[PDB]
Ligand binder design. Sequence first.
Ligand SMILES: CCOC(=O)[C@@H](F)[C@H](O)c1cc(C)on1
Lengths: 412, 412
Amino acid sequence: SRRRVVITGMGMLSPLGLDVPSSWEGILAGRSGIAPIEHMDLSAYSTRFGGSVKGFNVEEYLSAKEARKLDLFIQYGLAASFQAVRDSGLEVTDANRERIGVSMGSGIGGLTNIENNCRSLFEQGPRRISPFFVPGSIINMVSGFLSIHLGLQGPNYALTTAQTTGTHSIGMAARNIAYGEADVMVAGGSEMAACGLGLGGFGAARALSTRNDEPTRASRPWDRDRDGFVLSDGSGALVLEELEHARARGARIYAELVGFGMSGDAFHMTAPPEDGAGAARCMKNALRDAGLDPRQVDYINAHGTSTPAGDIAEIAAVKSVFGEHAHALSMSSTKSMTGHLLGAAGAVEAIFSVLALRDQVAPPTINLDNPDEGCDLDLVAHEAKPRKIDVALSNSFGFGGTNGTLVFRRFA
Amino acid sequence: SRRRVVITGMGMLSPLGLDVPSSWEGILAGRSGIAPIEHMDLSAYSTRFGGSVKGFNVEEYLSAKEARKLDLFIQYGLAASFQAVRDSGLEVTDANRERIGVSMGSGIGGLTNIENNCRSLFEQGPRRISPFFVPGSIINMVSGFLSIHLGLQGPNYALTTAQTTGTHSIGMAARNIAYGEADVMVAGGSEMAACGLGLGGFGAARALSTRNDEPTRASRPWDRDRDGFVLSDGSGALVLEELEHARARGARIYAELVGFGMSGDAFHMTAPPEDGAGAARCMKNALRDAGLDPRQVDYINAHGTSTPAGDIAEIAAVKSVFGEHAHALSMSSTKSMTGHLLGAAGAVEAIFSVLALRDQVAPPTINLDNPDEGCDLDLVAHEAKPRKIDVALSNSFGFGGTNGTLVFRRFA
Ligand SMILES: CCOC(=O)[C@@H](F)[C@H](O)c1cc(C)on1
């Protein structure tokens, strides 16, 4: 048997806002967070826009001295984690600190720092590399700094599964609680890949939208005029907690995490199979883990990246899994508004799936002006749809054919 | 209910050899794999040596066409993975491919490829970044490419917990099998951080030995004249398999994986506490997980990095956990010969711990000429020690205060 896992705290930085409620207000209003990237000469690049975090003040979280040691993606992950722990109301004590851990991940980690230290090495040589370069750029330092700051002695680790990172981080933290290795975990992901190397790396693969003239219309999942993903920055963190632990302290419970699925496509390094076979196995595994029939699903937060092959693969997977229920559920891509936060995508989308359950509303897929061939599901085009949602799924698909699915249920 | 996990296949690249048996022959002979680095001009660097893989032929494993796209850390992790799968004798079929997964991690991933693309960006422009830059550098692509080449459709992920990565990867993969999420996992880690950014970055932190004039004597764990770690490259992979699955197919079983522990120090971003409290908590978790009397432990493969603070913290932790039995067990650091493979250290050292069980021999700590104050255990100084080993423990400790311990025992 297995313990039950609930969500008692959430925290976020996104292109829509510097916390959860601001971001969520943007989501339900159909607002875009996408804009031309500032303070960077992107003349030579084929994409000049993305989803930046606007107005982030690290000194709300860290001293200027500790902030100078840490890449932006670590700053973002710590901001989301501190927000989530504050939101949970949890009091860390000597009686519980060995039972509270962290799994905050990243797909790409400290590209900005790597770029800046490369500049020093190439121009001046290795004596200009920062002493804090390695520990301030490695992906496990959100988990590391968080544990140090709050005195958390439970399982401490970090996943890096590309665009699936935030989903796998949350799912595996839920397993740690369900199987009694922890009572509380802070889990999610963070990303800041808007450097030359990030825009340039994805651009070299021709993976990005190049709709420079209308950045807010670039991210258009399932639209016939889509031309690749939009790169975005930010973080999401959830406090996962064992149910009896949450009830005993009078925690506010947002939702229950009832299932987690993983699978591998074993197909291609960057493209999914056209029929979404791996995404179908992953969703079936998550529903089996939850003891739910596909017909019980009400809302899917799609991966929905705005790539030709990815968006159509997801439609095929959902039709395969859900059969005569495939049109009854609502499925939307919040990446239509946020762009693609890579390893933080699954974290901010798990939060949006939990809020869909709290507020009984499916967020819109904006920009879905002309659904592509076979994209005939309820994709919540243009505007939020109030509806009944008892069960919400969140999907992530990543490079290497790595798949994750989370299943959330209303808690009463 | 929780299933038993055994080791059926192993594979390795190390500074001592291009496979497991050649590496283990070096270990038992007390041979150093450390030498001046040949691949680059390090005259401006404070450290000019390390543990390189010598004479690696990627065309024993991969087409030159595909090898050209992949960072060395991916090539190394695929080589070790292919070895381990072949060594296991497992045949991947439609009947079992959904039950076989992979968790190969890395501390730093494709830093050489990142540095080379950064050089292209800065000297030429973004149009010269490789289209393969992202999928050929990101940490999850050992798991991804292995899954694509062998058709593994089970859990597909990667950990990044700095110098703890390989141990965490093996333990979490064993929990996947224990809890029924998979029947087989390939797990371990790979690292190739020996580029200017890596040698420069660890150099800037003054973390590295600077014994340039005597490289084979630089790594000297618990020796009074130690002056930091030696950076080394390579990979370890193990095939983990559920016990009844292994028995059913008549697999050769090397040993049983009976315990796994994790803990966070919550102390310091890079420094271990002097008393080794987090390391002690981690070992105690692992011993309780394995259902053991601590007096059953016969052999410990230490982390043993050859840092002043790390080596003495590990003596303090072993004394705290084992009491008077601390004087009966044997403990050695194989990093005395291999150097520190960072995220691959825990993977190669898990393999050495399994072979200590197979061959009933404690590998030596070479270079231990003058044990430091309080370093008065059996540290197997200079020469391999044949002895009874029923239970072997492998420890790792990393940046962020992240700790892992694996417990292996003989299987009859
Ligand atoms: C392009 C993909 O880059 C990454 O994933 C980087 F973050 C790099 O792997 C890294 C550098 C350091 C130090 O730690 N990790």
